[PDB]
Amino acid sequence: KYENHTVTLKILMTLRYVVSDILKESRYQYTKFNQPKSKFENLPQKLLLKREDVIVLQDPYKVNDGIEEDLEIQ
């Protein structure tokens, strides 16, 4: 029916981001208190994220689990 008609859509899409820079990239602590020995732990990175508009890829194909959500137990 719409061979030569125009069509317009208002659409909802998942939010997505890519890492365009890594900023304050590494922060460190020699944690020693209440440890057998000195341990090195990497504290949180800060990321400068960028939206995906020019090129769009579908949501990744995650492997599902067969555990039913909100499952009764007795």
Partner: protein
């Protein structure tokens, strides 16, 4: 009977076959089918593939690491990849909600217990709680 399915029951047999290195096919819910494999060489770890078709000169499978969960294996159905049948041309799949009528003209719901056929291609279906066979027309596919 039909030889189109041979599901594995025990996870122990699944692990035994994985040790032998044979590929597996693992179904999903409203989602693409998966192939699973054990990596060769020194380091042993699971690998997965989103592709399904047989390997050929024009088609090669892609394998990557993934932390596969035993829950998926134990819960979801599993088959040997080489011996899997793509489709059995029947209206209703196995383990599907269906509706029928009992011997006393009483309507009742059930799931398909077995899928059968004669030599002429006519398909007969057996429901849970019903030993007798049912025609394709006599059944009704219940809407979710």
């Amino acid at each position: 009977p039909i030889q189109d399915a041979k599901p594995i029951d025990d996870i122990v047999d699944i692990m035994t076959y994985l040790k032998n290195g044979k590929v597996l096919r693992v179904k999903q819910d409203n989602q693409g089918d998966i192939l699973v494999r054990m990596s060769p060489g020194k380091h042993k770890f699971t690998e997965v593939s989103r592709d399904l078709d047989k390997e050929s000169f024009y088609y090669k499978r892609h394998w990557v690491l993934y932390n596969v969960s035993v829950n998926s294996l134990i819960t979801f159905d599993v088959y040997l990849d080489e011996e899997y049948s793509e489709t059995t041309k029947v209206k209703y799949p196995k383990d599907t909600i269906v509706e029928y009528t009992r011997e006393d003209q009483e309507k009742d719901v059930a799931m398909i217990k077995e899928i059968l056929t004669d030599n002429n291609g006519n398909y007969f279906y057996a429901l849970i709680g019903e030993t007798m066979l049912f025609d394709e027309n006599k059944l009704n596919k219940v809407k979710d």
